[model samples]
Target: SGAIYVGNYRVVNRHLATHNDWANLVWEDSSRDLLVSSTTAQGCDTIARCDCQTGVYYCSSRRKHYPVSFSKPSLIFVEASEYYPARYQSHLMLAVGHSEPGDCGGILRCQHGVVGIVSTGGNGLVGFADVRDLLWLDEE
Candidate 1:
C-alpha cells in the first residue's frame, strides 16, 4: 500500500508509515465521503490521524462473536462486486462495478458503519485491507 491525499485533510499517519496494507482510517468530508486511493501523495495540507475508531463488518455474522479489539487484528472481509450477495460476506461492499489500485485506501461503509479501507481489487472483485491493524510510526 501507499500514502494518499484527499481534499485539505491528508493522512498524517497512513501509508506514510509503510506496510503491506497501509490504510488505518476511512475518509469523508462535509458529509461527502472520500475514497482513499493508494498512490503518490501530494503531501498534507493538514494533519490527520488514523487513531479514530472505524467499525468492522464480518465475512459471516458468526464472526461477529469475535470483535475487533484494541491492536488485535481480525479477519474482516470485503467484496467490491456486482454479482455476489452480501449474504454472509463483508465490508463497504459495493454491489456494483469494481475497485482498482487507485481505490486502495478508499473507505468502505456498511450498515451505518465504517467497514474498512480498500487495499486490493480486480475487474469483478475488490479485496479489503482492513484498517483493523497498523500502528503509530515508521521505519521506511
Candidate 2:
C-alpha cells in the first residue's frame, strides 16, 4: 500500500492555534488490495452470511471477460456505464490500501480517507495504465 501524507502537524496546529495535536500521521504497511471501508463493504454483500465467514464477489474485465483477484486495496472513483447497466464505466485510484473502519454499516473496509473506496469482488475491475488517470486530490 502507498503512504498518504496527513500533512505537517505543527503547521496545522499553528493555523488552528492549538497546542494539542494528533501524532505525525502516515499510512504505511498498507495492503495491495483495494480496501473497502467496513461500511462500504456492506454494499457488496448481496446476501448476509453467518458470522466469521468472508463473503465473496466476482470481478471481471469488460473487454476481455478475464477474472481478477480480490487483492490490492485502492482508492477508486467509479461511474456507472450506461451501455451495461450491470457494469461500471471505469474505476481509478491513487494506490492500494487495506480495508479499515468507516462512519457506517457497523464496520466497513474502506481506504483510510475520503479518496479511498472498498474493493469488492464482481462489480467492475479495470486498471488504469497511467497514474495521471487518477483524480487530483487536495487537503481540505
Candidate 3:
C-alpha cells in the first residue's frame, strides 16, 4: 500500500452567475484532476494512488486554477456575449483573457477594483456578471 493523506475540503458556495458556463465555487476549507499535459516530467501521485483518499466534496476543476494578473489591468467594454450588458463595453480589455473550460467562474479585476465574475463563454465566447450585484451573495 502506497497511499498518503492530502487534505479535506467542501463546497461552500456553488452558483451560476449568468449562464451555465458562468460557474464558480467557494471552497469551505481550501483547494485537481485531469492533465492538460506537458512535455516535462515531475514526480507526483496518479489516479491509481492519489485517488485513494476520499471526501464528501471535491471541486477538482480548480486544481490547476489560479489567480490572473494584468500589468495594466484596466476595464474597457466590448461585445463579449449577450450575458454581458451591452450598454457598457467594460468587460475584458485587449482580449477576453481567460479562455478555458473551467475558467467560467474566475474573478475579473483591475488594480483594487473588482470588475466582475465570469458569467459564461456564450457561444464559446466571454460574458461577465457585474461584481456589485454579486456582493450580497453568501452574506453573513
Candidate 4:
C-alpha cells in the first residue's frame, strides 16, 4: 500500500468561510473521493468538484458510515513513480497561500490519469495539470 501527503499548505478563514455559499470551484470525481479531513482547524476534509458549464462547485461525498467534515484544500503534486497495478503512486504536497500564515501547497490524490484543480484564493478557473500530468510545483 502507498500513502498520500499534503505539504506547503495555507488556510484562510475569512475567504473560506464563505465557500459553502459560492458555486463549485473544483472539478473532480467524488464517488470514491480520496482525501483526509480538513487540514486546518476551520477547514473541511473532502474533495470538491466544479461545473465546466456554469462553474458551480460540487462538494465532496465521503464514504457512508464515516463521520468526517470536508475541507477544500489546494493539492500540489510533489513526486510520482510507477507502482503496483502500474498505477502512479504520486507523492502529494500542500500549500495554502490565502491565510494570515499562508500554507505551502499540499499533497492530494485523484485517479491515476485524472487532473486535480487548485485555488489560489477563490474558485478555480483553470487546471494545474492534465489528469496524468502529476508534477512537482517547487521542482523538489
Which candidate tops lDDT? Answer: 1
lDDT of 1 at 18: 35
How many steric overlaps does candidate 1 have? 4
Residue 31 lDDT in model 4? 18
In what order do the candidates fall by TM-score, top score first?
1, 3, 2, 4
True-vs-predicted CA distance for residue 21, candidate 4, Å? 28
User: Per-residue lDDT tens digits of candidate 1, residues 1-140?
Assistant: 33334332233213223342235333422111123324344433222224433334232212231123222123334334333322233222332225554554444443333335444445554454433222221111
> Which residue runs of candidate 4 sit more than 4 Å off their true CA positions?
1-33, 38-40, 44-49, 53-85, 88-140
Give the candidate number with the greatest TM-score. Answer: 1
Q: Please give the ranking of all candidate structures by lDDT, highest first, separated by commas.
A: 1, 3, 4, 2
lDDT of 1 at 62: 26
TM-score of each: 0.30, 0.18, 0.28, 0.18
**Model 2 / residue 88 / CA error / Å:** 3.6
lDDT of each: 0.34, 0.22, 0.28, 0.22
Q: Is candidate 1 or candidate 3 better by TM-score?
A: 1
lDDT of 2 by residue, 23-92 (tens): 3322111222221111111121111111211212112221111222333323444343321133231232
Selected candidate, larger TM-score, 3 vs 4: 3
- Candidate 3 weakest ten by summed lDDT: 28-37
